[PDB]
Every structure is written in structure tokens, then in C-alpha cells.
Design a binder for this molecule. Structure first.
Ligand SMILES: *[C@@H]1O[C@H](CO)[C@@H](O[C@@H]2O[C@H](CO)[C@@H](O[C@@H]3O[C@H](CO[C@H]4O[C@H](CO)[C@@H](O)[C@H](O)[C@@H]4O)[C@@H](O)[C@H](O[C@H]4O[C@H](CO)[C@@H](O)[C@H](O)[C@@H]4O[C@H]4O[C@H](CO)[C@@H](O)[C@H](O)[C@@H]4O)[C@@H]3O)[C@H](O)[C@H]2NC(C)=O)[C@H](O)[C@H]1NC(C)=O
Ligand SMILES: *[C@@H]1O[C@H](CO)[C@@H](O[C@@H]2O[C@H](CO)[C@@H](O[C@@H]3O[C@H](CO[C@H]4O[C@H](CO)[C@@H](O)[C@H](O)[C@@H]4O)[C@@H](O)[C@H](O[C@H]4O[C@H](CO)[C@@H](O)[C@H](O)[C@@H]4O)[C@@H]3O)[C@H](O)[C@H]2NC(C)=O)[C@H](O)[C@H]1NC(C)=O
Ligand SMILES: *[C@@H]1O[C@H](CO)[C@@H](O[C@@H]2O[C@H](CO)[C@@H](O)[C@H](O)[C@H]2NC(C)=O)[C@H](O)[C@H]1NC(C)=O
Lengths: 52, 139
């Protein structure tokens, strides 16, 4: 009550901290995942069936 | 030069054997080929078994009745015929030549190794030929 505080969503650092967070978790999870490096090979490809 | 087994006569029905020998062991890196020469009908390619021992190609038209062996210890080429029909009455030549083992599609690995490679080999030439062995089949 009787409290006035200035706010600034654009200079707020919580968004920067949480963006850095999200990047960190994204980087963290896929690190113990299978590396798809043995797939970049020349693919022989043809047009696909019943399609629109 | 090369040496071949002497002329042979066979009753149709049984099998025949032909031996092609190099002088000593001077022709071991070169690959081995067998050819046939029906008079007035050109020449046919019986097959080959290479030199490292990793190929045994024999034309399917003669696959059933013809076998090609190589004895390393004596360095001797063996040609075995089974059907011995009238069409086999001709001259068989042993040839020593060279191939080109090119490397076609090969799957390198991520670390740089060689997982596998088809490395199909191409026939280059037949420098050395035997004196020719005549096989006569008469009924
Ligand atoms: C990077 O990767 C490439 C892949 O292409 C590689 O190039 C190739 O290397 C192989 C390995 O040597 C070469 O294979 C040899 O080719 C020669 C013919 O070369 C001539 O002709 C080609 C065109 O076809 C020219 O481009 C070239 O400049 C030459 O003029 C064949 O004659 C060789 O055959 C011998 O070896 C075979 C086994 O490898 C035997 O089966 C065969 O009977 C031949 O035997 C030879 O050795 C015997 C003793 O072992 C001897 O007794 C015989 O008399 C005979 O001399 C061989 O197949 C291939 O040509 C290269 N080029 C291509 C397009 O594939 C590079 O070398 C590589 N770079 C590196 C590793 O640094
Ligand atoms: C490591 O790498 C080395 C060379 O880099 C390999 O050594 C060669 O391996 C090949 C297999 O890819 C071997 O080739 C095979 O040899 C067999 C030996 O057969 C003997 O007996 C028959 C009668 O049953 C004889 O006719 C023959 O001349 C031999 O005396 C052959 O039977 C095989 O033939 C089959 O395959 C060919 C095509 O490959 C067909 O055309 C035939 O009809 C048949 O189906 C074949 O040729 C070769 O002998 C090996 N050489 C040496 C010096 O070892 C190693 O195998 C490799 N090792 C590993 C673990 O990768
Ligand atoms: C993609 O290509 C594969 C390889 O041809 C197709 O799989 C074959 O499909 C045919 C019918 O088109 C079947 O007879 C074969 O049994 C299938 N397997 C193999 C190993 O040939 C596959 O259907 C294609 N995908 C499509 C058309 O959507």
C-alpha cells in the first residue's frame, strides 16, 4: 500500500538472464544425444504415392 | 614366355584338365586369364581369378562346366572342363596380364577411416600368353 516503483521491461535484465538460461538448457540436453555426423552422405532421391 | 599342357583328346562326357606353368616364379604379381579360340568364330574369354586371390570371375555362359584354379606353391594355373561337348573342341590359351584396381564409391568414416569400398577392378591388358593347348572331342 502507498507504494510506487518504476518499471522498465526493455532495460530489464531478467529477460537476458532467462534467455541465457534457455540456451544453456537447450545446449545441455542434446549433448548426451546421438551424434548424427555419420549421415552426411550423398543421398539418391526420388519423388515420392498418393499426394495432393 | 609361358608353358601349357600338351594337346589332349577326350571322349565326350568325362572331364579334362589343362595346366599352364610359368618358368619358375617370375610371374606372380600378374593376374591370370583363360581364353578360348573356336576357329572361324573369334575368341572368347573364359574368365580370370586375379592375382591377390580376391576374385574368381567366370562368365556365366561357361560357369557351370568350367573351373579355374591357381596353385601358389607350384605357381600353376589349372583349368578344369566337365561337359566336354562338341563345342569345346578348340584351343584354350592361358594368359598372364595386368588389371587396374580403381577405387570407386567408398564410405570413409567420420574419423577418416575406410569402412568399405567396392573398388571394382578393370582389365588392362594380357601381355603374356601360353603356347595354346588343343582339346579335341570326338564321338
Ligand atoms: C587419394 O585417393 C585417390 C583415389 O582415386 C588415389 O588415386 C588412386 O590410387 C590408386 C592406388 O594406387 C591407383 O590405383 C593404381 O592405378 C594404377 C594405374 O594408374 C595409372 O592410370 C591412372 C588412370 O587409370 C592414372 O590416373 C595414374 O596416374 C596412372 O597413370 C594401376 O596400374 C594400379 O594397379 C596396380 O595395383 C593393383 C592393386 O592396387 C594391382 O591389382 C594391379 O595388378 C597393379 O599391380 C601393380 O603392382 C604390382 C605389385 O603390387 C606390380 O607387379 C604390377 O606390375 C603393377 O605395377 C593401381 O590400381 C589409382 O590409379 C589412383 N587414381 C584413381 C583415379 O583412382 C590417390 O593415390 C590418393 N592419394 C593419396 C593416397 O595420397
Ligand atoms: C583383411 O584384408 C585382407 C586383404 O586386404 C583380406 O584377405 C583376403 O580376404 C578375401 C575376402 O574378401 C579373401 O577372398 C576369398 O578367398 C577365399 C579363399 O578360398 C580358397 O578356397 C577356394 C576353394 O573353396 C579356392 O578356390 C580359392 O582360390 C582359395 O584358395 C575364396 O574362396 C573367396 O572366393 C569367394 O568370393 C569371390 C569374390 O570375393 C567369388 O568370386 C568366389 O566365387 C567365392 O564366392 C574369396 O576370394 C582372400 O583370400 C584374402 N586374402 C588373404 C591373403 O588373406 C582379409 O579377409 C581381411 N580380413 C578382415 C577380417 O577383414
Ligand atoms: C522409397 O523407396 C523405397 C525403395 O524402393 C520404397 O520401398 C520399396 O517400395 C516398393 C514399392 O514401390 C516395394 O515393392 C519394396 O518392397 C519396397 N522396399 C524395397 C527395399 O524396395 C519406398 O516405398 C519408397 N517410398 C515411397 C514410395 O513413399
Amino acid at each position: 500500500e502507498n507504494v510506487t516503483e518504476e518499471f522498465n521491461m526493455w532495460k530489464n535484465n531478467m529477460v537476458e538472464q532467462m534467455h541465457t538460461d534457455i540456451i544453456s538448457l537447450w545446449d545441455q540436453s542434446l549433448k548426451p544425444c546421438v551424434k548424427l555426423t555419420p549421415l552426411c552422405v550423398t543421398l539418391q532421391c526420388t519423388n515420392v504415392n498418393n499426394i495432393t | 614366355q609361358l608353358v601349357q599342357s600338351g594337346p589332349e583328346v577326350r571322349k565326350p562326357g568325362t572331364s579334362v584338365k589343362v595346366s599352364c606353368k610359368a618358368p619358375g616364379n617370375t610371374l606372380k604379381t600378374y593376374d591370370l586369364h583363360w581364353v578360348r579360340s573356336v576357329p572361324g568364330q573369334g575368341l572368347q574369354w573364359m574368365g580370370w581369378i586375379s592375382h591377390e586371390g580376391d576374385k574368381k570371375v567366370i562368365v556365366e555362359r561357361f560357369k557351370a562346366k568350367v573351373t579355374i584354379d591357381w596353385d601358389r606353391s607350384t605357381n600353376t594355373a589349372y583349368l578344369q572342363l566337365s561337359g566336354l561337348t562338341s563345342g569345346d573342341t578348340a584351343v584354350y590359351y592361358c594368359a598372364k596380364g595386368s588389371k587396374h584396381r580403381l577405387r570407386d564409391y567408398a564410405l570413409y568414416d567420420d574419423d577418416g577411416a575406410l569402412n568399405w569400398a567396392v573398388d571394382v577392378d578393370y582389365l588392362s591388358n594380357l601381355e603374356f600368353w601360353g603356347q595354346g593347348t588343343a582339346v579335341t572331342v570326338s564321338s
